[PDB]
C-alpha cells in the first residue's frame, strides 16, 4: 500500500487502522495460519519503520508471545495482538531477551511501543473502546467473546504468565533478568516497567 508515499506517521496509523478494519478476518488467520498472516504485504510498510537490526529478533519474541496466548486458552487480548501484530512481519530470529519495548523510527530517532500497556504511539482505553496513535483516532476495537478476564497475561513475557499485581507474600520485586533462575510453576514479583511490580509465574509447560 501507498501509505509509504506520505511517509512514517502514515505507516503507523494506517497500519493500525487497516488492522482493525480487517480484524474480523485477521483474527481468524491468527489462529488458523499465522505464518501467512505475518507474511502479508499490508505489513511491509510497517517493517520499514523498525531498525533493520532488532526487527527480526522482535518478530521472534512476538511470534513466541502469540503462540503462548494460543496455547494458554483463557488469556485472549485483542489490543495486545493488534498492538504487536506488525512486528511479526520481519522474519524471526532467536533472541533471549525480554523486550519491554519496540522502536519505531519516526523523525530521526522515533518512538517506543510498550509490550505492556500504553504509549503515545499506541493508546487504547478499555471502558471506552477507542484506539489512538499519534493523537490520531485509529478506529475502535470490539473485543472477543472469550476475551480474557482472569487477569492473566500470556503475551508480555517469553516464558511467564503475569497473574496480577504485586503480592507481598512472594518477596520483594525481582528484576527481569533474575527470571531465568526461577523454576516451572515458581511465582515471583517482578519489575515489569513503569513503577510496576506484577506477580508472575514461570510457566509449567513448554513453549510450543
Amino acid at each position: 500500500m501507498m501509505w509509504e508515499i506520505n511517509g512514517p506517521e502514515s505507516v503507523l496509523v494506517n497500519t493500525y487502522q487497516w488492522i482493525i478494519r480487517n480484524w474480523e478476518t485477521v483474527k481468524i488467520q491468527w489462529s488458523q495460519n499465522p505464518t501467512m498472516l505475518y507474511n502479508k504485504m499490508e505489513f511491509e510498510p510497517f517493517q520499514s519503520l523498525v531498525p533493520k537490526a532488532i526487527r527480526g529478533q522482535y518478530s521472534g519474541f512476538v511470534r513466541t508471545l502469540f503462540q503462548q496466548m494460543r496455547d494458554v486458552l483463557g488469556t485472549f487480548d485483542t489490543a495486545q495482538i493488534i498492538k504487536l501484530l506488525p512486528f511479526a512481519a520481519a522474519p524471526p530470529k532467536q533472541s533471549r531477551m525480554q523486550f519491554s519495548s519496540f522502536t519505531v523510527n519516526v523523525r530521526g530517532s522515533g518512538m517506543r511501543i510498550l509490550v505492556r500497556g500504553n504509549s503515545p504511539v499506541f493508546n487504547y482505553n478499555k471502558a471506552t473502546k477507542r484506539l489512538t496513535v499519534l493523537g490520531k483516532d485509529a478506529g475502535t476495537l470490539t473485543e472477543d467473546p472469550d476475551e480474557g478476564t482472569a487477569g492473566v497475561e500470556s503475551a508480555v513475557l517469553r516464558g511467564f504468565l503475569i497473574l496480577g499485581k504485586e503480592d507481598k507474600r512472594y518477596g520483594p520485586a525481582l528484576s527481569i533478568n533474575e527470571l531465568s533462575n526461577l523454576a516451572k510453576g515458581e511465582k515471583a514479583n517482578v519489575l515489569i516497567g513503569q513503577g510496576d511490580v506484577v506477580l508472575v509465574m514461570k510457566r509449567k509447560r513448554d513453549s510450543s
Side-chain angles (χ1 to χ4, degrees):
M1 255 112 141
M2 61 104 234
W3 307 308
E4 215 100 33
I5 294 162
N6 195 274
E9 262 97 348
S10 148
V11 167
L12 246 276
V13 351
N14 279 311
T15 285
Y16 291 121
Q17 273 166 162
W18 183 85
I19 283 158
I20 89 197
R21 246 185 265 132
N22 295 67
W23 182 230
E24 169 144 24
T25 222
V26 137
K27 168 168 37 182
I28 112 81
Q29 167 147 267
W30 187 82
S31 340
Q32 311 324 126
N33 193 170
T35 24
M36 180 147 36
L37 205 200
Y38 308 140
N39 288 305
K40 252 183 155 55
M41 284 166 336
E42 290 97 325
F43 293 133
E44 288 174 31
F46 192 100
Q47 221 42 124
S48 278
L49 274 44
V50 93
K52 202 181 161 136
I54 28 160
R55 199 224 51 193
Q57 285 68 303
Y58 283 175
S59 160
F61 188 54
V62 159
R63 275 169 215 233
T64 290
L65 253 41
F66 271 174
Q67 192 64 33
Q68 284 188 9
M69 193 156 125
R70 280 184 201 97
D71 288 8
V72 175
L73 318 197
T75 53
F76 192 83
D77 195 322
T78 284
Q80 177 75 12
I81 205 265
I82 289 164
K83 183 167 87 187
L84 304 186
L85 188 32
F87 301 101
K93 281 193 179 151
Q94 49 211 315
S95 164
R96 123 211 206 102
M97 191 142 16
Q98 315 257 232
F99 297 111
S100 298
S101 304
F102 302 103
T103 87
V104 293
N105 286 331
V106 176
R107 60 276 339 293
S109 264
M111 287 107 113
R112 101 228 175 294
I113 317 245
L114 296 165
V115 177
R116 176 154 206 277
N118 278 140
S119 180
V121 205
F122 193 99
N123 187 101
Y124 186 57
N125 58 347
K126 76 90 177 123
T128 289
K129 216 81 16 178
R130 238 251 267 295
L131 181 62
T132 343
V133 303
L134 291 338
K136 260 271 324 197
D137 240 29
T140 124
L141 307 193
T142 43
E143 96 203 359
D144 201 270
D146 307 354
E147 193 80 356
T149 6
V152 357
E153 320 175 17
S154 61
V156 186
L157 290 159
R158 170 169 218 131
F160 292 69
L161 293 179
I162 305 203
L163 295 170
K165 49 188 149 233
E166 174 162 43
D167 190 3
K168 301 243 148 275
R169 289 120 40 55
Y170 287 92
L174 318 192
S175 146
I176 300 262
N177 275 93
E178 304 179 303
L179 294 195
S180 316
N181 298 166
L182 265 57
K184 291 188 192 208
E186 207 185 323
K187 297 204 206 154
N189 293 322
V190 205
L191 199 66
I192 198 64
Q194 264 48 26
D196 296 332
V197 190
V198 304
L199 182 69
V200 322
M201 183 185 106
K202 218 272 191 151
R203 222 146 67 86
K204 307 172 182 205
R205 40 289 292 188
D206 289 343
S207 308
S208 218

